[PDB]
Design an enzyme around this catalytic site. Structure first.
Site, mmCIF file in Angstrom:
data_model
loop_
_atom_site.group_PDB
_atom_site.id
_atom_site.type_symbol
_atom_site.label_atom_id
_atom_site.label_comp_id
_atom_site.label_asym_id
_atom_site.label_seq_id
_atom_site.Cartn_x
_atom_site.Cartn_y
_atom_site.Cartn_z
ATOM 1 C CG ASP A 1 -1.900 1.105 1.287
ATOM 2 O OD1 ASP A 1 -1.836 1.983 0.408
ATOM 3 O OD2 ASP A 1 -2.744 1.147 2.220
ATOM 4 C CB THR A 2 2.255 3.401 -2.699
ATOM 5 O OG1 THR A 2 1.057 3.571 -3.477
ATOM 6 C CG2 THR A 2 3.088 2.262 -3.296
ATOM 7 N N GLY A 3 -0.124 4.196 -0.329
ATOM 8 C CA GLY A 3 -0.853 5.257 0.372
ATOM 9 C C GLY A 3 -0.682 5.259 1.888
#
Ligand SMILES: Cc1cccc(C)c1OCC(=O)N[C@@H](Cc1ccccc1)[C@@H](O)C(=O)N1CSC(C)(C)[C@H]1C(=O)N[C@H]1c2ccccc2C[C@H]1O
Lengths: 99, 99
Positions: free
Chosen positions: B25-27
């Site tokens: 999850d790059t968020g």
């Protein structure tokens, strides 16, 4: 481009002729932008995040540029904490995760 | 590996001697795992995103394995809807976004 993850992967997008900042977010199924005006009819959608669920407005076939890459697809509008570019448009611009 | 974004980028991780599925999850600034035991001291933390905030326990210096790559870092434990590998550990495995 190749974007490392030491800081938030924030990029410039263009939507409705306006420049905005958004997060490239592989944890987001779809793209969600803060309240703004978009053309056309919208449909209801409920989306679930870390804190629970929010209601958003779903607009289809919306023209949007992400780091200068042109996409046309679904954009949700609602009380997101930050503008998020999710997998629906990350796939359009040919974005992958690599290690 | 190269991971496309047509579906959720889920991988198997090893943590605290347990196998779990988690989302790359790059968020997410940090890594959060559903309730489990971890060694050492912890402190409480609130983390926020869509839907607002949840309370978690922050454990530091935790070893995880993600796709054969060992990393060490902070791991949060709490009522997350989905196990999430965040940027603090993605960097350590040399994970980047590419398009
Ligand atoms: C499932 C779905 C369907 C349709 C549309 C969408 C958008 C969608 O995704 C929803 C969603 O919210 N997805 C989460 C992943 C997720 C999926 C399901 C449940 C909970 C989280 C992702 O987009 C994200 O990490 N986010 C988004 S807000 C954020 C601050 C940028 C960040 C966040 O919480 N970040 C926080 C976070 C997360 C984990 C650990 C620490 C921290 C600190 C913050 O950085």
């Amino acid at each position: 481009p190749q974007i490392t993850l030491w800081k938030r992967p924030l990029v410039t997008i263009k939507i409705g002729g306006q420049l905005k900042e958004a997060l490239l977010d592989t944890g987001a199924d779809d793209t969600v932008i803060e309240e703004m005006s978009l053309p056309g009819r919208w449909k209801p959608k409920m989306i679930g995040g870390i804190g629970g669920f929010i209601k958003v407005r779903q607009y289809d076939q919306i023209i949007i540029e992400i780091c200068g890459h042109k996409a046309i697809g679904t954009v949700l509008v609602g009380p997101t904490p930050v503008n998020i570019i999710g997998r629906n448009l990350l796939t359009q611009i040919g974005c992958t995760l690599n290690f």
